[PDB]
Short mmCIF file of C-alpha atoms in Angstrom, two decimals:
data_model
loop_
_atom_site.label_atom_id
_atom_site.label_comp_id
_atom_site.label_asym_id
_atom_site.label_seq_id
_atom_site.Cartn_x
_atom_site.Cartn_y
_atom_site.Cartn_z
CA UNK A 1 -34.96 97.42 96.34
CA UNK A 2 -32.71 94.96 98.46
CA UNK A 3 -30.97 93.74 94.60
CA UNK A 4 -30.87 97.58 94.26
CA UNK A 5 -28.77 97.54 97.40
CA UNK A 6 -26.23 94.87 97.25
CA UNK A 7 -25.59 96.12 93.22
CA UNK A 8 -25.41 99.69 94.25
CA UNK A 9 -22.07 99.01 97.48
CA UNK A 10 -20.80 96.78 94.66
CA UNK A 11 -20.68 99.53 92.42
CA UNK A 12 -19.49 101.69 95.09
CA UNK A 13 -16.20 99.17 95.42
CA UNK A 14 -16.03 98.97 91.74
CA UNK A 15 -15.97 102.52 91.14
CA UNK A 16 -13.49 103.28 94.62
CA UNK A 17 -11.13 100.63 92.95
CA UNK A 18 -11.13 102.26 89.39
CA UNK A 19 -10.35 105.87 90.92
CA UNK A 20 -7.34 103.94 92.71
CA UNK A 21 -5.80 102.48 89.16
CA UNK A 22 -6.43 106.27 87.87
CA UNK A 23 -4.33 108.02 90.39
CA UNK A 24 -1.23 105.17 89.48
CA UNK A 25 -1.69 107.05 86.08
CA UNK A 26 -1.81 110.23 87.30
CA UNK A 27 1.26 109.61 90.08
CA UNK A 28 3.15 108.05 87.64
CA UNK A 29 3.30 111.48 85.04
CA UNK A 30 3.99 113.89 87.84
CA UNK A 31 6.40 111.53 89.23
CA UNK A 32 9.79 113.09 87.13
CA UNK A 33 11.60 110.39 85.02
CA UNK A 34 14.57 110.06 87.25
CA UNK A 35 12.86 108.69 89.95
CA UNK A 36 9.88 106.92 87.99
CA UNK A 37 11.99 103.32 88.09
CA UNK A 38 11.35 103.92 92.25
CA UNK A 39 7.58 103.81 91.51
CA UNK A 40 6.87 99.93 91.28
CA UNK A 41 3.38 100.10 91.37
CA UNK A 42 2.44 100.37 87.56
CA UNK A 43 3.44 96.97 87.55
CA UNK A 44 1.80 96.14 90.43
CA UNK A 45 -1.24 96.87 88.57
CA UNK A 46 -0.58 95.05 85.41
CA UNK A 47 0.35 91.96 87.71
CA UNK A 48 -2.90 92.34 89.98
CA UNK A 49 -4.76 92.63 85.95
CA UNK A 50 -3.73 89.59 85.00
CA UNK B 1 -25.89 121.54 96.31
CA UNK B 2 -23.35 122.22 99.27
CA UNK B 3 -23.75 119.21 101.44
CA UNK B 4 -22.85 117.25 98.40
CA UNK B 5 -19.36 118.76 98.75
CA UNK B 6 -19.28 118.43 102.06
CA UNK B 7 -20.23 114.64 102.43
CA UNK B 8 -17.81 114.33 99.25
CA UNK B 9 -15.10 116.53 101.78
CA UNK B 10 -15.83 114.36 104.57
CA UNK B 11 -14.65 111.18 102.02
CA UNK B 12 -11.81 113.21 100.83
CA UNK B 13 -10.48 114.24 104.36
CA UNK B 14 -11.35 111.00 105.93
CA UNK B 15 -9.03 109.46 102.91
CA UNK B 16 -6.37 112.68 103.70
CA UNK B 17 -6.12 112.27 106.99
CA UNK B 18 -4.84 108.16 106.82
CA UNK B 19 -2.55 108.93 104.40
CA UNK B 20 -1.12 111.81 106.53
CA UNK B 21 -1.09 109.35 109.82
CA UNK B 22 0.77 106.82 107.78
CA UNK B 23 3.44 109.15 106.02
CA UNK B 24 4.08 111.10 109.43
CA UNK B 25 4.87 107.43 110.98
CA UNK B 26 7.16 106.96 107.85
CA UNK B 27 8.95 110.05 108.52
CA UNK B 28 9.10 109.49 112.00
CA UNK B 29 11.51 105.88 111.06
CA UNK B 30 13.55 108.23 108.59
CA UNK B 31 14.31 110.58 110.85
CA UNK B 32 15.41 108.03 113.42
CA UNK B 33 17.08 105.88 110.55
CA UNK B 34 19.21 109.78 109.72
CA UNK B 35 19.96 109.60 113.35
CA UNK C 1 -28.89 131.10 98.65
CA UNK C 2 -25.47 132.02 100.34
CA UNK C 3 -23.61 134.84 101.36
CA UNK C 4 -20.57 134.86 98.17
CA UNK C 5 -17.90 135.07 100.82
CA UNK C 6 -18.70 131.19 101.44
CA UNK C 7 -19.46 130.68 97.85
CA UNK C 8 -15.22 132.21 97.27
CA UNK C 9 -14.47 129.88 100.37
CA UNK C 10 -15.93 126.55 98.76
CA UNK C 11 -13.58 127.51 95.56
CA UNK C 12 -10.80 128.23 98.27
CA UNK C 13 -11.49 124.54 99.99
CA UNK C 14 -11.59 123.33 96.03
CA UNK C 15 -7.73 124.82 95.59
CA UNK C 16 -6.41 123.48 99.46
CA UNK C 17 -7.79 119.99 98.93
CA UNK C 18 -5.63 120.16 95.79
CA UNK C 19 -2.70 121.46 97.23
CA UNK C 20 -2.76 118.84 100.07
CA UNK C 21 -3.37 115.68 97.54
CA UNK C 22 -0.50 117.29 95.42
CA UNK C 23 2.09 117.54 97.95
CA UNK C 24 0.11 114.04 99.76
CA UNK C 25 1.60 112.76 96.29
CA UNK C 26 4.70 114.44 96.22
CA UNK C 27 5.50 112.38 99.39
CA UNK C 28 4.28 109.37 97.20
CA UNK C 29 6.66 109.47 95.30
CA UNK C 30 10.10 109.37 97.82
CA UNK C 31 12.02 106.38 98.44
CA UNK C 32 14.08 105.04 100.96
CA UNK C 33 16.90 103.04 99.07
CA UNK C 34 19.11 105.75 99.21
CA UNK C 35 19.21 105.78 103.09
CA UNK C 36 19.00 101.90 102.69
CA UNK C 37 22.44 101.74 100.71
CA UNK C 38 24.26 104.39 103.60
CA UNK C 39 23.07 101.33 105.60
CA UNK C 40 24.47 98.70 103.34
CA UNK C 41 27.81 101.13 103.09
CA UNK C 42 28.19 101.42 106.93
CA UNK C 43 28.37 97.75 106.69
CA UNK C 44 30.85 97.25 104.09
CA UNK C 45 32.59 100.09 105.09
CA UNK C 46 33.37 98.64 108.87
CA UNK C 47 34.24 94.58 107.62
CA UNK C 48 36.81 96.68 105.12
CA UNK C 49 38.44 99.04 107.71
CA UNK C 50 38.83 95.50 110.09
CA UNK C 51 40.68 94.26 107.09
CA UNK C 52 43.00 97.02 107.05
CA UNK C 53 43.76 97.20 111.21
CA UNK C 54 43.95 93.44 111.47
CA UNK C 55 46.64 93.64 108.96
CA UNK D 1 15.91 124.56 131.80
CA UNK D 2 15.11 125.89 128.13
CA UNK D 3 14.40 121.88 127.40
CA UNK D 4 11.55 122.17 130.28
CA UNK D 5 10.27 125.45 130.00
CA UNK D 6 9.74 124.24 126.17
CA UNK D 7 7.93 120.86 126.75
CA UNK D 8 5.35 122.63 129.44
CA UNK D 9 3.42 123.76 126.78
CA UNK D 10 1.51 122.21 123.79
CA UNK D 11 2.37 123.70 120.67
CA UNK D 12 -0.33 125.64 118.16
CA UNK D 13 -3.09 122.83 117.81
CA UNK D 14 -1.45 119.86 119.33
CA UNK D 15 -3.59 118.14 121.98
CA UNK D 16 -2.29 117.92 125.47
CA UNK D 17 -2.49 113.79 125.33
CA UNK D 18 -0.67 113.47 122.12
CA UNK D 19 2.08 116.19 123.46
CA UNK D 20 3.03 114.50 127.06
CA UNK D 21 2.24 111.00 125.55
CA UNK D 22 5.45 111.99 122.34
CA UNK D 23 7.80 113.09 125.35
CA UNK D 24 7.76 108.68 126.70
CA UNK D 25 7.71 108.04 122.62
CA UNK D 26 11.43 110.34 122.44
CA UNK D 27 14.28 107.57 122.62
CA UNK D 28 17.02 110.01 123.55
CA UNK D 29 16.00 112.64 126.33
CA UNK D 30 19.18 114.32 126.22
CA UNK D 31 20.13 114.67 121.91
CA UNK D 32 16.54 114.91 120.94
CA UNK D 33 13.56 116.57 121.64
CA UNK D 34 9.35 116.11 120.21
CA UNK D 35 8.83 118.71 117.55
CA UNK D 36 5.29 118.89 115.52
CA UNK D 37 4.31 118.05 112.58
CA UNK D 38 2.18 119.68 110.67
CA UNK D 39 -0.08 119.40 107.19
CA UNK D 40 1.90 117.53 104.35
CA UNK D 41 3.84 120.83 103.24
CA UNK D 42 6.10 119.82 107.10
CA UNK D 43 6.16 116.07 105.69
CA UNK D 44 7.43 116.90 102.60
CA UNK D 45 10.14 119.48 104.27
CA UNK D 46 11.32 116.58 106.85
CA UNK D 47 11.72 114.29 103.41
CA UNK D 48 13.81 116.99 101.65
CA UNK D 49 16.31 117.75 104.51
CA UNK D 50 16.35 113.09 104.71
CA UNK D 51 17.16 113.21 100.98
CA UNK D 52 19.95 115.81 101.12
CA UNK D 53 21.40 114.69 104.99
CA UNK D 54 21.01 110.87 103.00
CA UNK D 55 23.52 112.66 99.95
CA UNK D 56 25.49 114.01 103.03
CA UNK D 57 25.90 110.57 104.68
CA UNK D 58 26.50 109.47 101.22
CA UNK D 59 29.40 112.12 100.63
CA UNK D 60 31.52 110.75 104.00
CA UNK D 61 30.94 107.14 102.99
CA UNK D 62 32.20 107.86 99.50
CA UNK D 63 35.61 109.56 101.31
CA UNK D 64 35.87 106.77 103.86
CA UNK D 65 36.00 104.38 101.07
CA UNK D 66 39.33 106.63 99.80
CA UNK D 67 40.26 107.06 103.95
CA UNK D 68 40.25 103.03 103.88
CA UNK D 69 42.21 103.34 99.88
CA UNK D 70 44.82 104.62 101.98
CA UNK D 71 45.00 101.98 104.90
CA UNK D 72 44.92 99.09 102.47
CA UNK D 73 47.86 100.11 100.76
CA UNK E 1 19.66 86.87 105.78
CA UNK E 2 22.77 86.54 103.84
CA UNK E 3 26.03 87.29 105.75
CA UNK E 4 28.08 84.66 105.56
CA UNK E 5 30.86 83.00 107.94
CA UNK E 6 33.34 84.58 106.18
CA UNK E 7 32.31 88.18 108.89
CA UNK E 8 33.39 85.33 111.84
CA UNK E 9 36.35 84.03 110.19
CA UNK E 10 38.14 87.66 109.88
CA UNK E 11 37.80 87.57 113.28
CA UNK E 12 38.76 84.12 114.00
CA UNK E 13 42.18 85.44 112.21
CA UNK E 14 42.49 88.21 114.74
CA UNK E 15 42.46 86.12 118.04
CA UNK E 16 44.76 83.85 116.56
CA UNK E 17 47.20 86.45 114.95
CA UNK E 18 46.90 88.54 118.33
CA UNK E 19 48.38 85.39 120.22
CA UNK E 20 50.60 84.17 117.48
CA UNK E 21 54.50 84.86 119.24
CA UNK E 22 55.42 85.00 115.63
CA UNK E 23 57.64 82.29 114.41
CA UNK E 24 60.25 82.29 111.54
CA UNK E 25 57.82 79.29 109.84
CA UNK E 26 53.84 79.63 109.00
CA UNK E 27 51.84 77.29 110.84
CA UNK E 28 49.46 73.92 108.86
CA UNK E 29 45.70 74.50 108.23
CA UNK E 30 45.11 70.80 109.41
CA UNK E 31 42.06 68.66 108.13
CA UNK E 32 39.24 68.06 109.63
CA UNK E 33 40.34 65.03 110.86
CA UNK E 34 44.03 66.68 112.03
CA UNK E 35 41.54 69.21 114.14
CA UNK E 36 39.88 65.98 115.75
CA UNK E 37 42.86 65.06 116.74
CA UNK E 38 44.07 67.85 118.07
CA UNK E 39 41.38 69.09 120.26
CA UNK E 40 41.34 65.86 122.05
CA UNK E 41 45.30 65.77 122.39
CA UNK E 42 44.78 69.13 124.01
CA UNK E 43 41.82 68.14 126.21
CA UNK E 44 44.20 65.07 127.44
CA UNK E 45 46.84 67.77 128.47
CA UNK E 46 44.23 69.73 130.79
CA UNK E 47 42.51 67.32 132.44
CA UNK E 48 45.28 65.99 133.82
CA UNK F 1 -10.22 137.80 127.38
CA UNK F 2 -9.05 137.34 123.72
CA UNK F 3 -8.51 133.43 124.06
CA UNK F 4 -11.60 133.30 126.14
CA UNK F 5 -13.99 135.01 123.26
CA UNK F 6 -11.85 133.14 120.55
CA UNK F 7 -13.29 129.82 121.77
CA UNK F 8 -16.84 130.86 122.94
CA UNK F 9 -16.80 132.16 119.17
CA UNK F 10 -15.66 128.86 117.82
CA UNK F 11 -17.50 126.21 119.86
CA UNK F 12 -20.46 128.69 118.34
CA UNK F 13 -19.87 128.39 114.96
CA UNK F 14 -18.77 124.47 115.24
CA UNK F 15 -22.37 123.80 117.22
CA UNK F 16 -25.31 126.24 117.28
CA UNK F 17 -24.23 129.22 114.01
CA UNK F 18 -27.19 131.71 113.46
CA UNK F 19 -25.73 133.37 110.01
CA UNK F 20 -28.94 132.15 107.98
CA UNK F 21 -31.99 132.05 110.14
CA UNK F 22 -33.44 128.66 109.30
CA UNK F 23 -31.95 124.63 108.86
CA UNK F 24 -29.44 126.07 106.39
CA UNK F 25 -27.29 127.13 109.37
CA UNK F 26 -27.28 123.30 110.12
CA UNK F 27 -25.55 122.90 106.84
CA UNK F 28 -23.46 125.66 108.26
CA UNK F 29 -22.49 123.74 110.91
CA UNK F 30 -21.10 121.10 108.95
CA UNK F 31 -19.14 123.85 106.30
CA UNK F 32 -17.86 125.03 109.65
CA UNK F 33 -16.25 121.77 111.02
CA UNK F 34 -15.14 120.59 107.47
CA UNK F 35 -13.15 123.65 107.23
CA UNK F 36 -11.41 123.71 110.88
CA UNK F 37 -10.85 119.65 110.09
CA UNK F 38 -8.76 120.64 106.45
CA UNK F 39 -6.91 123.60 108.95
CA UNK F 40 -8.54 126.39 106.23
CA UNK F 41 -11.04 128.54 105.63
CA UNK F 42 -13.84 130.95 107.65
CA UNK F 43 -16.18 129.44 110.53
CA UNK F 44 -19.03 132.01 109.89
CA UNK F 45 -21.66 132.13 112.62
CA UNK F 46 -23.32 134.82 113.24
CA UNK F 47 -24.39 138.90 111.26
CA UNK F 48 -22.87 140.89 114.35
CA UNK F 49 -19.44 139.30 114.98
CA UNK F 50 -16.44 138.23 112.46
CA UNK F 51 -15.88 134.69 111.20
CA UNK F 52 -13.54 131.94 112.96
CA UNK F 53 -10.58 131.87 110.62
CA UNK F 54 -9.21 128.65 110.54
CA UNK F 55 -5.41 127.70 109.56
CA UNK F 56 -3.66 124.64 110.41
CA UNK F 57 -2.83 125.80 113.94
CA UNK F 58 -6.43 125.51 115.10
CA UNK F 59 -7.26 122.20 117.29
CA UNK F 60 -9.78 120.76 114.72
CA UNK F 61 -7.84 120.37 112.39
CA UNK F 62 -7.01 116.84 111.61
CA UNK F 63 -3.22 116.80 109.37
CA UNK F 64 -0.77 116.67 112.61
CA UNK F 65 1.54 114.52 114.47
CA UNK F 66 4.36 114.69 116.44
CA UNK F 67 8.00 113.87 115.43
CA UNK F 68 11.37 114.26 116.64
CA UNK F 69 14.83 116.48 116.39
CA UNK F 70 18.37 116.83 117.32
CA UNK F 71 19.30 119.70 119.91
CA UNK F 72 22.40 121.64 119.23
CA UNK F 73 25.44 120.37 121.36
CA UNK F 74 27.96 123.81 120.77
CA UNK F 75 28.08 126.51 123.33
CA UNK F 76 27.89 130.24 123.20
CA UNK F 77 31.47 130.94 123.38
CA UNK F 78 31.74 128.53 120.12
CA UNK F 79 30.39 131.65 118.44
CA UNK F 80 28.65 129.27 116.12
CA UNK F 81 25.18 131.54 114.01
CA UNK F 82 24.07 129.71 111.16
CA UNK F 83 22.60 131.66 107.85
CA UNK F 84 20.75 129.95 105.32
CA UNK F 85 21.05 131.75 101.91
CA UNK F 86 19.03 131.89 98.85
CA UNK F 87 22.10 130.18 97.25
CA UNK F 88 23.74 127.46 95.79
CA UNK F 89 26.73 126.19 97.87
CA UNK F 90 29.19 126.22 94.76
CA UNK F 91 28.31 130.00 94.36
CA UNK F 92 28.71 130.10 98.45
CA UNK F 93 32.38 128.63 98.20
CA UNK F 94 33.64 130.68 94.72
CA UNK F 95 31.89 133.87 96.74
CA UNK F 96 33.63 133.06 100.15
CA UNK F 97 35.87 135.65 100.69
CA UNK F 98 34.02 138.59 99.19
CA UNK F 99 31.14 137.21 101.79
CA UNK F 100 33.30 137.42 104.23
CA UNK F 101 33.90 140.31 103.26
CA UNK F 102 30.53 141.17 103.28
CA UNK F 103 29.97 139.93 106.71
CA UNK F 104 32.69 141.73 108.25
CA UNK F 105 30.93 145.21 106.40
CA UNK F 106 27.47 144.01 108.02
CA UNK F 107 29.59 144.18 111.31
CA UNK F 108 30.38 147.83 110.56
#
């Protein structure tokens, strides 16, 4: 149940961190395009992915 | 079936209320900067 | 097992988070550079006008 | 005496503590006075009005730069 | 930061060209070894 | 007396509600204090008295701050009353004189 535990607030982070990249995404389409070059953090993303 | 909204609420307001807190100190600095 | 009133306020709750996060991202979304450059300006502006009375 | 009568009382749903405590955090007692704010629809209204008084800063730095076209020359 | 000497010149300029009695000639921008020279030739004048 | 009530009525239905008659007014409780937290919705707390409505006003709720704003520095006798119209300014200046105009009919 403990190796239930530590998997499970793991998860937790994994799945918090995942709804995070997902609202870049949706940010990023109801940001209009002539202000979308302000919005760095697309890249941000791809540069914390690699 | 309603508490899950509400604990969900509580996560959603005590995300809300951070990013209110830090915006209202950002708009505090751009209203000074204006000045 | 509710009164609906609070069944029609849970929906209500469901549209006011919504319009929070949406204008919470709204904000998101403003920059500063703008007021940066009237910064950067009032610079330029100042060294060029002490040009023009030292001359 | 419109300035004090004003700051002797908290506005709707600001707490006492955060009201006196934002008249020591005002850095001009004299232009400005503490105004709340208010759910994110008052953010976003204060960000507005600095984007269009930043395009109105903008506007009399663009005609000092002609002002200055006249010095110059 | 990034703002150069050339702010503190523009108004090294000014205190010189509001002294300057203006002449009918420009005046030298000595060397470095001219200004040497001349700050101690000076300093030799006021401690007397 | 109105003030008074309002709060006895909302400490009740942020503490001890009696709407449901068992631990589903605990749950209550918390729907309560969510709601005046967000600054919307309906504290309800008891069968025999109305709900708490909550707006962004009430003390609970968590989305304020304080910021800061220029007084006016022009006196009375500078005449000066702004109106904000439901208007661009380029319409505004090509209307001018017919607003004045206008204006001057609005002052009879």
């Amino acid at each position: 149940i403990q190796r239930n535990t530590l998997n499970i607030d793991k998860l937790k982070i994994e799945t918090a961190q995942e709804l995070k990249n997902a609202e870049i995404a949706l940010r990023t389409q109801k940001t209009p395009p002539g202000l979308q070059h302000e919005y760095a953090a697309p890249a941000d993303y791809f540069r914390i992915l690699v | 079936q309603l508490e899950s909204l509400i604990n969900k609420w509580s996560l959603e307001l005590e995300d809300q209320e951070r990013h209110f807190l830090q915006q209202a100190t950002q708009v505090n600095a751009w209203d000074r900067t204006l000045i | 097992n509710l009164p609906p009133v609070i069944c029609q306020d849970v929906e209500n709750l469901q549209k006011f988070v919504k319009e929070q996060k949406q204008v919470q991202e709204e904000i998101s979304r403003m920059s500063s550079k703008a007021m940066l450059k009237v910064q950067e300006d009032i610079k330029a502006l100042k060294q060029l006008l002490s040009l023009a009375a030292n001359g | 005496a419109q300035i004090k009568q004003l700051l002797q009382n908290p506005p709707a749903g600001v707490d006492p503590i955060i009201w006196e405590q934002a008249k020591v955090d005002n850095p001009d007692s004299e232009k400005l006075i503490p105004v709340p704010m208010v759910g994110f629809k008052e953010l976003l209204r204060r960000l507005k009005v600095q984007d269009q008084m930043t395009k109105q800063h903008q506007t009399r730095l663009d005609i000092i730069s002609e002002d200055i076209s006249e010095l110059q020359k | 930061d990034t703002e150069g000497f050339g702010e503190l010149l523009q108004q090294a300029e000014q205190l010189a060209a509001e002294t300057e009695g203006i002449s009918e000639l420009p005046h030298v921008e000595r060397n470095l070894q001219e200004i040497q020279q001349a700050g101690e030739r000076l300093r030799s004048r006021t401690l007397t | 007396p109105t003030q008074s009530n309002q709060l006895i009525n909302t400490a009740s239905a942020l503490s001890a509600p009696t709407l449901l008659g068992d631990e589903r007014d605990a749950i209550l409780a918390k729907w309560n204090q969510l709601q005046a937290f967000w600054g919307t919705g309906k504290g309800y707390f008891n069968n025999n008295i109305p709900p708490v409505e909550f707006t962004q006003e009430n003390p609970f709720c968590r989305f304020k701050a304080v910021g800061y704003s220029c007084m006016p520095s022009n006196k009375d006798e500078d005449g000066l009353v702004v109106l904000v119209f439901n208007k661009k300014e380029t319409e505004i200046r090509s209307q001018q004189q017919q607003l004045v105009e206008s204006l001057h009919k609005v002052l009879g």
